[PDB]
């Protein structure tokens, strides 16, 4: 509860089950009904504090890949309403950051953001083995945040009905301590760069792509140490173009820039002790209409 | 056993099973020491006595299996031990059948 | 004899006269090809008609199945006999008969391949005792019918072992106290565990808990209370505890009346943790929580073990239980 | 009714065991000499209960018929054992020996032999009890619990009553209703407690109610009051005269009544129910472990505003209750209940550590 | 904080949910009491929020907008044409 | 092979085999003059 150091809880796709990754070397799971809440599940098997657990998809299966300290990730499986361990992946020197999943048509690939100076990608089919690939030689320091692209091709382009097929090509972005921001794209086994930008004057803290569930609009929100919040939005067709748009001249170190379920509303959380929902109005740019506590 | 006394054999077996002497390496031999007293068919045998004897033997083997390891066995004698347990159970079934026959024939 | 009905009537008359003259070895040794099912049905009808004082029709069926090589049929007959004895009487004799039947069924199931490890519900039927006045003569029970096969649910070897463990726990409770047989015949697993803990049968309590997959909070609370009583008591309490704990652990160090029961309880907890789990720390957590609720910090060897294990958990627990000085020294 | 009132108003029948023996002989010989009369009285009582039910359903006043002779005889036989100072255990001779309560330790001997026949009178009494357990009349919903409480006096009698309750409980249909079901059942008591908790939540879905929107039935209906008092007193007598039954009903895996009773004590409840729950919790904590658990729960929930470093003195709670409702009713049973509860708790477990892990031992506020 | 159906902020940490005229020491009764006598004598010198709660934060607070939202769409349904 | 995936599957397979044998013997007795 509030007595622990909760990072960011998660909710079921339906909205009746809640999960908190508390600092008690375990993960709690409540079932919220009517008014009061009831603690049902207490998963024990996470060494050290747990960062965050991302949800999978109902049509593909309930999978909650938990990421904790001590350089280890635990993939579980649910049966008859009970969760149990089924996969454990460890073997790292530097502390692993966070993990994320893939959207609907993109698949169900787990991205293990490790700060080992390399990238570790874990692909899972559905009920078989786990393909763990390692792309080495990133840069000087390890990565910090990672995000994926929407299921369709990158670039917001109006397609014809019954004429667009979402391919299985992978596109992702990784932001770390390197004063830059890149984007990698692969054809199921060929990671390569796409574009390069030199605008950040400080160490880039985190990045977050917004795969909008409704439009193929590609927009990446970045945050650094000073407070340069640039909204790299790509609204062309099929190419790549990012425009550095300073949202607000912040004076803190924002560590989280989460997106809504439709990747249209942005929730900022950092060293400002508050959360200002700078939503996107019906005329572009930004507008702050709500501000709550951290 | 050389002087032949199956009643005293069963009594000593029950006493040893209730006293529990020596570790598992000799508990195995103590539990095995039952077939020479089970393959026989002569001598008057009581139905209730055979029932309580087989119940005590099964309880002792269950306690031995539970004390060896939680729901598993160790050492190197696994298949041989299982075959010995099976043949001991078969001999015990034959002995209790003979005891039931004797109890039914005594009341004639 | 060619007529099937007349053959059945002749077999019934033979069973009647043999049970009257007390000659069962003849029917046991007489083989019956093809007509084995008819003989089994005749004996079952005779057992449903008469009581169980005149010999044992179910034991005769078991012997016939053993002679004609029918392990599954013998096991089903034994299970039905045990269920009937349990429905007739819930006393020590009934519990012993149920334990014997469960053990015989388990042996018959293990003698064959695991593909037959599950058995269906036995054949229904009532045993009318003492034909004349009341059809049911139960001194400690109701009716005398086995569970019918309406709810098709095959009883697995796990359920059989669970029933055997429950019956043996009831028998152990009745042996430890004669005025508790009928109480354990209808009591619950939690009450059984509490009684075993308050008596001193920790081995059987742990076995029952491991078979039932329940919790050990009550056992840990009882162990902590016993440790507190031994720490705050005297030589009389030490001797009273030794008289019940002298047969629980492997006597590696020669026991004596000089040293108290503190080291004995410590070695007992060590052995129990090693038999349970060497990685799960919930048992140690509950133990130290109950000790702090009693009003005494955890022992030095517990401190050393959990310090070589972790440290942040110790700091958090000390900060929660207001051990500020100990937590400060440990974090320093 | 006349003889029951005349015996109760006098203290002459208390002495002389021969008087108790003679009245027990009379009670046992009445139904043996009245065969079809018992069935006729049962049918008349069932008809009167059905008429009362249909009248209260259609809106008319319930008819007061003179067919309560069975309930009057039951009241007499229940008050006799309650007022008799001797300890001969008439329930042992009244009940049937076929109930699960034997002291066996041998094989086929010493209360363990099978193929036996209980006495014919006890068999007939058990059959009548099993027949009356189904289709219970609505006019005798409270006398049954009253007589159960009256017969639960004594160790072996309480054990027999617990065995009967365990045999009655389970997956049944005619043992969970009121106008046609028997109240003696674990599932029945649990569903009743759940209904009362639902009524309290409908009044206010939070602890410590501040305003009542509508008056519930439990409080305005005398039948529910009598039933709850009778059931609580029966459970208290059972847990006071027996320990195995108390442990069995306290370690229930279906539902946890300890938390329900704790919430009811935290919230506002009539003083009679408060004192009943207090003495029930005392009889529960008669054991050392249960006493330690109850003391820890009491120190964690704080009934009395224990002030050692901070806290509102003379705040809302037991003090406010005894100054308001006790003073309004001019009766103070809650004080005696709390006193005996804390006395038993201190006797069974000394306060070695007050509170959970955020307090310190100290009897200064108390 | 958490997330939900687009503009639906659930509870997770600290936020400003719906306000209600029911705080302590106000006009016309409306009072409450917190866990005051819980820490007595020895305690842990550390204050932190206890327990949690699952509430909702909305911005409409209107029950008569159903007609204003349905009637224009009800008329649009007549002029709408299926494309398939 | 049919089902035989667990205990319930093996029980269903045994029941199906028994029913097949019963149907076979019944149709044989029906084809033969009673």
User: What distance in Å separates the CA atoms of residue B37 and residue B14, rounded to the nearest whole number?
Assistant: 13
Cβ pair C286, C225 in contact under 8 A: no
A64 contact partners, CB below 8 Å, separation of at least 6: A10, A19, A53, A54, A55, A56, A76, A83
Chain A residues 9-48 within an 8 A CB cutoff of chain C: 24-25, 44
Is some CB atom of chain C closer than 8 A to the CB atom of D171? no
Q: Looking at CA atoms only, how far is residue A117 from chain E in angstroms?
A: 31
Among chain A residues, the shortest Cα distance to E84 is held by A161
Name the residue among C194, C157, C145, C154 with its Cα closest to residue C173.
Answer: C194
CA–CA distance, C35 with C39 (Å, rounded to integer): 6
List the determination method. cryo-EM
* Rounded-to-integer distance, Cα C80 and Cα C125, Å: 10
Distance, in Å, from the CA atom of A150 to the CA atom of A162, rounded to the nearest integer, reads: 19
The full 3-state SS of D320-353, as one line of letters, equals HHHHHHHHHHCCCHHHHHHHHHHHHHHHHCCCCC
The three-state secondary structure class of A235 is coil
What is each CA distance from D354 to C294, C298, C330, D362, in whole angstroms? 9, 18, 26, 7
Name the nearest CA neighbour of A135 among A197, A68, A182, A167.
A182
Integer angstrom CA distances of residue C315 from C243, C326, E68? 39, 8, 59
Helix H or strand E segment including A74: strand A72-79
* Residue numbers in C near E45 (CB within 8 A): 324
Alpha helices in chain A (DSSP H): none
- Please indicate whether, in this complex, the C-beta atoms of E52 and A292 are within 8 angstroms of each other: no
Query: Is-contact C219 D276, C-beta < 8 A?
Result: no
Q: How does DSSP assign D215-258, residue by residue? A: --HHHH-HHHHHHHHHHHHHHHHHHHH-SHHHHHHHS-SS--HH
Candidates C325, A2, A49; CA nearest to E47 is A2
Tokens of A144: 């910090």
Distance (Å, whole) CA C81 – CA C59? 8
Please give the Cα distance from D102 to A161 (Å, whole number).
82
Query: Cα distance from E34 to chain A (closest Cα, Å)?
Result: 16
How many CB atoms are closer than 10 A to CB D291? 21
Whether the CB-CB separation of C88 and C138 falls below 8 Å is answered with: yes
Question: Smallest CA–CA separation between C276 and chain A, in Å?
Answer: 17
Query: How far is D256 from C318, CA to CA, in rounded Å?
Result: 31
CB-hemisphere CA count at 13 Å for E1? 30
Taking Cα atoms as reference points, which of D14, A24, D46, B106 lies closest to residue C22?
B106
- Give the residue on C whose Cα is nearest the Cα of B47: C59
**C28 neighbors C55 (Cβ within 8 angstroms):** no
Token reading at B55: 């119940």
The pair of three-digit structure tokens given for residue A264, joined into one six-digit string: 């249209």
CB D70 within 8 A of CB D41: yes
- Do chains D and F have 3 or more beta-carbon pairs under 8 angstroms? no
Q: Chain A: nearest CA to C302, how far in angstroms?
A: 20
Residues of C in contact with B94 (CB under 8 A): 66
- Max intra-chain CA distance, chain D: 73
Return the structure tokens found at C325. 């000085």
Question: Using an 8 Å Cβ cutoff, are A135 and A153 in contact?
Answer: no
Q: How many CB pairs under 8 A join C and D?
A: 119
CB pairs under 8 A between A and C: 3
Contacts of C320 in chain E (CB under 8 A): 44
> Which tokens in the block code for residue C329?
């020294």
Enumerate the residues of chain B whose CB falls inside 8 A of the CB of residue C210.
70
> Which pair of structure tokens corresponds to residue D191?
């569903």
**Long-range CB pairs of A194-197, under 8 A, 24+ apart, other chains included:** A194/A240, A195/A240, A195/A241, A195/A242, A197/A232, A197/A242, A197/A244
Q: How far is E43 from chain C (nearest CA, A)?
A: 6
Tokens coding D205: 């879905």
Distance CA A118, CA A137 (A): 6
Query: Would an 8 Å CB–CB cutoff place E77 in contact with chain C?
Result: no
Interface test with F, best of C72, C112, C118 (most F CBs within 10 A): C118
Neighbours of chain B (3+ CB pairs under 8 A): C
CA distances from D196 to C215, D183, D190, D199 (A): 30, 15, 10, 5
Give residues 264 to 293 of C whose Cβ lies within 8 Å of A: 282
CB atoms near residue C204 (< 10 Å): 20
Per the structure block, which two tokens stand in for A158? 């109006």
Alpha-carbon torsion, ordered B104, C1, C4, C7, to 10 deg: -20
E77 Cα to chain D: minimum distance (Å): 43
Within 8 A of D163 by CB-CB distance, chain C residues are 182, 186
- Torsion angles phi and psi, residue C310, rounded to 5: -125, -160
Alpha-carbon gap, residue C229 to C223, rounded angstroms: 10
With a CB-CB cutoff of 8 Å, which residues 42-61 of chain A face chain C? 44
The packing angle between helices D271-284 and D318-329, to 10°, is 130
Please name which of A284, A278, A164, A163 lies closest in space to residue A216, comparing C-alpha atoms: A164
- DSSP for C170-225, please give it: HHHHHHH-GGGHHHHTT--HHHHHHHHHHHT-HHHHHHHHHHHT---HHHHHHHHH
Q: Do D310 and E41 touch (CB under 8 A)?
A: no
Q: What is the maximal distance between C-alpha atoms in chain B?
A: 50
CA distance B98 to D126: 44
CA distance E12 to A10: 9
User: Across the D/E interface, how many CB contacts are shorter than 8 Å?
Assistant: 45
Chain C residues with CB-CB distance to D102 below 8 A: 91, 140, 181-182
Query: How far from C187 is each of A40, C21, D102, E1, CA to CA, in Å?
Result: 27, 43, 14, 49
Closest-CA residue to C170 (of C137, C143, C196)? C196
Name the phi and psi angles at A50, rounded to 5.
-100, 130
Q: Taking the mean position of all CA atoms in its chain, how far away is CA C268?
A: 23
A105-124 burial code (b ≥16 CB/10 A, e <16): ebbbbbbbbbbbbebbbbbb
b/e code D97-134 from CB counts within 10 Å (16+ = b) = bbbbbbbbbebeeebbbbebebeeebbebbeeeeebbe
Among C59, C96, C276, the residue with its CB nearest the CB of B100 is C59
- Kindly report each contact of residues E71-76 with a partner whose C-beta sits within 8 Å and lies 24 or more positions away, as own/partner: none
Beta carbons of C129 and D115 less than 8 Å apart: yes
C-alpha dihedral (D345, D348, D350, D355), degrees to nearest 10: -50
**CB-based contacts of C138, cutoff 8 Å, min separation 6:** C88, C89, C129, C144, D98, D114, D116
Phi, psi of A54 (to 5 degrees): -100, 145
E36/D360 Cβ within 8 A:
no
- By C-alpha distance, the chain D residue nearest C186 is D166
Instruction: Give the DSSP H or E segment for A19.
Output: strand A17-20
Q: What are phi and psi of E48, to 5 degrees?
A: -155, 150
Report the candidate in D336, D324, D155 with the shortest Cα–Cα distance to residue D245. D155
DSSP code of residue B90: H
Cβ–Cβ under 8 Å, residues C165 and B65: no
The DSSP symbol for C126 reads B
Task: Determine E/C contact with 3+ CB pairs under 8 A as the test.
Answer: yes
Q: Hey, what are A215's tokens? A: 């439009």
User: Quick one: closest CA in E to C320, which residue?
Assistant: E44
**Nearest partner of C231 among C200, C265, C262, C269, judged by Cα:** C262
What one-character-per-residue DSSP string does A203-226 give?
A: -EEEEEE---TTS--EEEEEEESS
H-only helix segments in chain D: 2-9, 17-33, 35-58, 69-83, 90-94, 120-133, 143-151, 155-168, 186-203, 217-220, 222-241, 244-250, 257-266, 271-284, 288-301, 318-329, 333-348
């Amino acid at each position: 509860s509030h007595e622990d150091m909760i990072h960011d809880a998660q909710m079921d796709y339906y909205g009746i089950r809640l999960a908190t990754c508390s600092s008690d070397r375990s993960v709690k799971i409540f079932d919220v009904k009517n008014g009061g809440q009831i603690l049902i599940a207490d998963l024990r098997g996470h060494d050290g504090p747990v960062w965050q657990v991302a949800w999978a998809h109902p049509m593909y299966g309930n999978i909650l890949a938990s990421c904790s300290y001590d350089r280890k990730v635990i993939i579980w499986k649910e049966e008859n309403g009970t969760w149990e361990k089924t996969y454990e992946y460890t073997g790292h020197d530097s502390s692993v950051n966070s993990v994320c999943w893939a959207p609907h048509d993109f698949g169900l690939v787990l991205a293990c953001g490790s700060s080992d100076g390399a990238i570790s990608i874990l692909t899972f089919t559905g009920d078989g083995p786990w393909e763990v690939k390692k792309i080495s030689n990133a840069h000087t320091i390890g990565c910090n945040a990672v995000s994926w692209a929407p299921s369709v091709i990158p670039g917001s382009l109006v397609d014809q009905p019954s004429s667009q097929k979402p391919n299985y090509i992978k596109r992702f972005v990784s932001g770390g301590c390197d004063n830059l921001v890149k984007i990698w794209r692969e054809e199921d086994g060929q990671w390569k760069e796409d574009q390069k930008l030199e605008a950040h004057s400080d160490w880039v803290r985190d990045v977050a792509w917004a795969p909008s569930i409704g439009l193929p609009t590609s927009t990446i929100a970045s945050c650094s140490q000073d407070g340069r919040v640039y909204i790299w939005t790509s609204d062309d067709a099929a190419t790549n173009c990012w425009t550095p748009k300073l949202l607000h001249k912040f004076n803190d170190v924002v560590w989280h820039v989460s997106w809504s379920i439709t990747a249209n509303i942005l929730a900022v959380s950092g060293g400002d002790n508050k959360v200002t929902l700078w939503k996107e109005s019906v005329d572009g740019q930004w507008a702050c209409i709500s501000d709550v506590n951290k | 056993y050389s002087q032949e006394q199956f009643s005293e054999a069963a009594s000593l077996l029950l006493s040893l099973m209730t006293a529990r002497i020596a570790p598992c390496s000799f508990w195995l031999t103590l539990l095995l020491d039952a077939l020479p007293l089970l393959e026989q068919k002569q001598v008057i045998f009581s139905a209730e006595q055979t029932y309580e004897l087989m119940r005590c033997l099964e309880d002792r083997m269950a306690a031995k299996l539970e004390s060896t390891s939680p729901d598993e066995i160790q050492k190197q004698d696994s298949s041989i031990d299982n075959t010995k347990v099976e043949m001991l159970r078969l001999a015990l079934a034959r002995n209790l059948a003979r005891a039931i026959v004797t109890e039914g024939a005594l009341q004639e | 004899i060619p007529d099937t009905s007349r053959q059945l009537d002749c077999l019934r008359q033979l069973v009647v006269v043999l049970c009257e003259r007390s000659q069962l070895q003849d029917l046991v040794e007489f083989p019956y090809v093809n007509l084995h099912n008819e003989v089994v049905g005749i004996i079952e009808s005779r057992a449903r008609a008469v009581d169980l004082m005149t010999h044992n029709y179910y034991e005769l069926l078991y012997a016939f199945h053993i002679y004609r090589h029918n392990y599954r049929k013998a096991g089903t007959v034994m299970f039905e006999y045990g269920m009937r004895l349990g429905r007739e009487v819930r006393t020590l004799r009934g519990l012993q008969k149920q334990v014997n039947s469960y053990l015989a069924c388990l042996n018959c199931l293990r003698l064959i391949r695991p593909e037959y490890a599950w058995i269906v519900q036995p054949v229904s039927g009532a045993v009318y005792e003492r034909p004349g006045a009341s059809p049911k003569r139960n001194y400690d029970g109701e009716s005398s019918a086995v569970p019918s096969s309406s709810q098709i649910e095959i009883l697995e070897l796990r359920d059989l072992e669970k029933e055997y463990v429950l019956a043996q726990t009831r028998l152990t409770l009745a042996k430890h106290n004669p005025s508790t047989a009928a109480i354990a015949g209808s009591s619950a697993a939690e009450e059984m565990v509490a009684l075993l803990v308050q008596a001193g049968l920790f081995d059987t309590a742990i076995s029952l808990c491991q078979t039932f997959k329940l919790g050990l909070t009550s056992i840990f609370e009882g162990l902590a209370c016993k440790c507190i009583r031994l720490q705050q008591g005297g030589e009389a309490a030490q001797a009273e505890a030794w008289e019940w704990l002298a047969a629980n652990q492997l006597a590696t160090v020669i026991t004596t009346k000089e040293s108290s029961a503190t080291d004995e309880a410590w070695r007992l907890m060590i052995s129990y943790l090693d038999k349970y789990e060497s990685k799960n720390t919930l048992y140690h957590h509950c133990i130290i929580n109950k000790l702090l609720s009693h009003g005494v910090p955890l022992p030095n060897w517990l401190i050393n073990r959990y310090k070589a294990m972790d440290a942040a958990e110790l700091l958090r627990l000390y900060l929660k239980y207001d051990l500020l000085e100990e937590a400060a020294e440990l974090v320093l | 009714l006349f003889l029951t009132e005349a015996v109760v108003g006098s203290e002459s029948f208390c002495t002389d065991e021969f008087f108790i023996r003679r009245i027990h002989k009379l009670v046992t010989d009445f139904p043996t000499l009245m065969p079809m009369k018992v069935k006729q009285l049962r049918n008349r009582a069932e008809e009167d209960a059905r008429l009362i039910q249909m009248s209260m359903q259609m809106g008319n006043e319930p008819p007061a018929s003179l067919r309560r002779d069975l309930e009057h005889l039951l009241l007499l036989i229940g008050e006799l054992y309650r007022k008799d100072p001797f300890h001969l255990e008439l329930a042992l001779e009244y009940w049937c020996p076929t109930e699960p309560l034997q002291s066996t330790s041998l094989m086929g001997s010493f209360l363990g032999v099978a193929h036996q026949r209980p006495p014919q009178r006890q068999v007939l009494l058990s059959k009548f009890v099993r027949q009356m357990s189904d289709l219970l009349p609505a006019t005798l919903y409270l006398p049954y619990l009253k007589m159960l409480r009256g017969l639960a006096s004594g160790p072996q009698c309480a054990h027999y009553c617990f065995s009967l309750l365990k045999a009655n409980g389970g997956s049944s249909a005619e043992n969970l209703q009121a106008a046609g079901g028997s109240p003696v059942s674990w599932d029945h008591f649990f569903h009743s407690l759940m209904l009362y908790h639902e009524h309290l939540r409908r009044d206010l879905p939070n602890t410590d109610n501040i305003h009542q929107r509508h008056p519930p039935l439990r409080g305005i209906t005398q039948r529910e009051l009598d039933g709850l008092i009778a059931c609580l007193q029966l459970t208290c007598t059972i847990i006071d005269w027996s320990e195995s039954a108390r442990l069995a009903l306290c370690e229930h895996a279906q539902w946890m009544p300890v938390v329900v009773i704790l919430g009811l004590l935290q919230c506002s409840i009539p003083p009679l129910l408060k004192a009943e729950l207090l003495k029930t919790l005392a009889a529960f904590g008669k054991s050392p472990e249960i006493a330690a658990s109850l003391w820890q729960s009491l120190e964690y929930t704080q009934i009395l505003q224990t002030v050692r470093a901070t806290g509102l003195r003379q705040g809302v709670g037991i003090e406010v209750e005894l100054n308001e409702i006790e003073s309004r009713c001019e009766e103070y049973p809650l004080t005696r209940a709390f006193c005996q509860l804390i006395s038993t708790l201190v006797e069974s477990s000394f306060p070695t550590n007050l509170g959970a892990g955020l307090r310190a031992p100290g009897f200064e506020p108390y | 904080v958490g997330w939900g159906p687009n503009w639906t902020l659930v509870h997770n940490g600290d936020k400003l949910s719906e306000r209600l005229n029911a705080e302590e020491d106000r006009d016309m009764d409306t009072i409450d009491y917190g866990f005051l006598p819980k820490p007595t004598s020895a305690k842990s010198l550390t204050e932190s929020p206890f327990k949690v709660h699952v509430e909702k934060l909305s911005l409409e607070q209107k029950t008569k907008d159903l007609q204003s939202y349905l009637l224009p769409l009800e008329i649009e349904l007549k002029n709408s044409t299926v494309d398939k | 092979l049919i089902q035989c995936y667990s205990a319930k599957g093996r029980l269903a397979q045994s029941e199906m085999a028994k029913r097949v044998a019963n149907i076979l013997r019944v149709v044989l007795s029906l084809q033969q003059p009673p």
